[PDB]
């Protein structure tokens, strides 16, 4: 019957893997003890987004909202428009949509409207230079997230258009047992409704920490102005460590709130990315929940991904646990032969998943 | 702690700032085959050579956990909730075959296949006619609907399979990956085998989804009764003037081919309307309006389960439209008007 789990924990993850599997899923006990129980607007809106792109799926939310029964349909997609509630930005909905984009009947051309950045959710550049490049490694050749207008909190109103012009049967088998060498560090500095000196003070704060390194740095000074620069002033930084050898990338991001010194938050993202590097072996823990799931839906072949000691935390475990019930796939780990570092090799297999929803 | 917070947990400023006063501890991270066929074969072989290596490294208990039970292993499988009759009506001569099912196989819904009448089958097949198909490991009976693209403008319901070509077929049943071919048979029982070739159709499954939008063509017919050159009045096309109001301006044409329009409904009598044509029509002309009405696929599923029977060779399900008429002694329906007759044309002399 229905695989039954508890809580809102990993809510999106448990629907999309259900969607990828085709196995129906039940989630119950969504904050039963809270004063305001049941699903919130953003995660109801997200569950609506799935119905827009999936076809034949039936979704029921309980009388109190504390239980949802999800039977997935085939993934069909198309041109559509979604209203992101002000609670969460577009990035909350686009990241899980990347889990499902390349495996559809017709192409995903979806317009997302609402806030575009938050302290807790992925920004545009996290998806653009931080999460998408992992798609070119996985076989998804051409795919883009076009920014037409950005909207900062609390009023938001931003616009982002997702296009995934690649559709593939399944992700390519994965082979990365080496710690990629980073060649250069790039990034984007952005702001709404405020003077460009902020975006320069962003870079100077970011520049200060990382000139102890011997690297070439080119942080884009980008300033949106006019009608397409949001209904609220706001700003944030995204610095990406880029490896041209095997096309690997690591990124860090956060946005500035009221009363913050720019050099301070510029100093953050430089040292913030810098901290992320120490804890990453082949992909960062902000790319880890992307790489593992696609490898689980690859072809019936074992690939290797190198993962660091710091990567395997509570996030790695429950995420691994969630995959097992839906797929019965288990991720084994074998130590590296090297003694300089204690990095780990995670061996996973695809379930033989294929894009049966495609026009052939 | 939870993935809804995309930005993951990090340490405080001052500790992290003190942690990285220097950029040390990270300096390490920072700075031919003759034919294309041989390249592809090697890529397959290396992956296979990779596969063998870890499994050897893995423990035998670890290996079975990850790969499962490889082919060639002699294995015991236990099943529960098996039908009672299967053990009782067990014949060792009849083989028992087990087949693993991929996730798409479990799903049920509409199946779109490009299907043709099997070439040596005596008769063409009919829409809404039971047909036992063999998809994957499963063999079951359904009611397929045969359709055409009409120059890739719409999915139009065909009444039979084409005599000597493929056509699009829609039917309901367990789904399968595209490009999974299949075979069709109308009769499986020995009693009704006869001497006809039993394979009825052969085709390729084309697409999968949960519904189809098959449509059938409708022609509403009209007769003229009063003509002024291009303009004429038509009757019994519609029962009321309100009906005409809906189709005002609709394109209409005669059997001769003189195209027309529905100009306005006549108040008296009900249903009468005025139409203008590119030429004067004659009294014997019949005007027609082309229209389209949706058709639905019947959700019928009858797995063919011979091994559960005593005979195992006399399974029978839905009967063909021919057999039911024969059993109940009904003649095949016919319309005298629909019948075709020889026509001889008299040369016309005009005044």
């Amino acid at each position: 019957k229905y695989t039954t789990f508890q809580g809102s924990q990993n809510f999106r993850l448990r629907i999309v893997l259900a969607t990828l599997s085709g196995k129906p899923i039940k989630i119950e006990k969504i904050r039963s003890g809270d004063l305001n129980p049941g699903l919130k607007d953003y995660e109801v809106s997200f569950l609506r987004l799935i119905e827009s792109v999936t076809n034949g799926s039936v979704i029921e939310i309980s009388y109190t909202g504390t239980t949802v029964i999800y039977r997935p349909g085939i993934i069909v997609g198309g041109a559509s428009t979604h209203i992101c509630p002000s609670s969460k930005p577009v990035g909350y909905f686009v990241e899980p949509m990347l889990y499902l984009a390349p495996f559809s009947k017709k192409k995903f051309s979806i317009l997302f409207k609402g806030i575009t950045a938050s302290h807790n959710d992925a920004g545009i550049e996290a998806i653009k230079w931080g999460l998408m490049p992992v798609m070119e490694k996985f076989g998804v050749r051409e795919c883009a997230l076009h920014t037409l207008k950005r909207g900062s909190p609390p009023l938001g109103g931003g616009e982002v258009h997702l296009v995934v012009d690649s559709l593939i049967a399944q992700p390519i088998t994965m082979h990365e047992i080496d710690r990629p060498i980073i060649s250069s560090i790039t990034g984007v500095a952005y702001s709404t409704r405020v003077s460009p000196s902020l975006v320069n003070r962003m870079i100077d704060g970011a520049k200060k920490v990382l000139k102890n390194l011997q690297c070439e740095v080119n942080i884009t000074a980008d300033v949106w102005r006019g009608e397409n620069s949001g209904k609220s002033p706001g700003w944030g930084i995204t610095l990406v460590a880029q490896s041209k050898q095997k096309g690997w990338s690591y990124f860090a991001e956060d946005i500035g709130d009221a009363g913050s010194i720019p050099e301070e938050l510029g100093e953050k993202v430089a040292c913030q990315l810098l901290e992320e590097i120490s804890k990453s072996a082949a992909v960062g823990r902000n790319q880890l929940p992307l790489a593992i799931v696609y490898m689980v839906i690859g072809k019936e072949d074992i690939g290797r991904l190198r993962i660091n000691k710091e990567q395997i935390d509570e996030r790695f475990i429950i995420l691994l646990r969630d995959i097992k019930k839906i797929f019965n796939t288990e991720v084994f780990l074998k130590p590296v032969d090297e003694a300089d570092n204690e990095d780990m090799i995670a061996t996973i297999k695809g379930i033989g998943f294929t894009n049966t929803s495609k026009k052939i | 702690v939870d993935l809804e917070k995309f930005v993951p947990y990090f340490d405080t400023f001052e500790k992290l700032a003190k942690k990285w006063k220097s950029v040390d501890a990270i300096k390490e991270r920072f700075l031919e085959y003759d034919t294309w066929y041989e390249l592809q074969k090697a890529k397959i072989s290396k992956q296979l050579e990779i596969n063998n290596i870890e499994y050897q490294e893995m423990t035998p208990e670890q290996r079975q956990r990850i790969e499962g039970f490889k082919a060639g292993s002699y294995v015991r499988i236990v099943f529960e909730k098996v039908p009672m009759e299967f053990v009782k009506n067990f014949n060792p001569k009849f083989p028992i075959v087990m087949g693993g099912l991929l996730p798409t196989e479990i799903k049920f819904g509409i199946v779109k296949a490009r299907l043709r009448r099997h070439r040596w089958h005596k008769k063409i097949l009919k829409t809404n006619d039971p047909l036992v198909l063999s998809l994957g490991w499963r063999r079951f009976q359904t009611l397929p609907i045969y359709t055409t693209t009409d120059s890739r403008t719409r999915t139009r319901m065909l009444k039979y399979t084409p005599e000597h070509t493929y056509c699009n077929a829609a039917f309901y049943g367990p789904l399968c990956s595209p490009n999974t071919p299949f075979c069709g048979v109308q009769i499986v029982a020995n009693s009704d085998t006869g001497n006809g070739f039993r394979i009825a159709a052969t085709g390729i499954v084309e697409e999968i989804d949960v519904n189809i939008e098959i449509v059938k063509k409708l022609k509403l017919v009209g007769f003229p009764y009063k003509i002024f050159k291009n303009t004429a009045f038509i009757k019994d096309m519609f029962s009321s003037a309100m009906e005409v109001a809906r189709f005002e301006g609709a394109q209409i044409k005669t059997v001769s081919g003189i195209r027309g329009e529905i100009k306005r409904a006549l108040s008296k009598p009900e249903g009468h309307y005025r139409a203008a044509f590119e030429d004067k029509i004659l009294m014997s002309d019949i005007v027609i309006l082309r229209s389209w009405y949706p058709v639905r696929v019947k959700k019928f599923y009858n797995p063919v389960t011979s091994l559960l029977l005593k005979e195992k060779t006399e399974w029978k399900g839905l009967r063909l439209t021919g057999q039911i008429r024969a059993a109940m002694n009904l003649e095949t329906p016919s319309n005298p008007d629909s019948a075709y007759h020889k026509i001889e044309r008299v040369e016309r002399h005009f005044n």
Binding site: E51, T54, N55, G56, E60, Y63 | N211
Partner: peptide, 10 residues
């Protein structure tokens, strides 16, 4: 459009 959102929330 096939499949429907059956919301029972009060």
């Amino acid at each position: 459009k096939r499949g429907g959102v059956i919301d029972k929330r009060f």
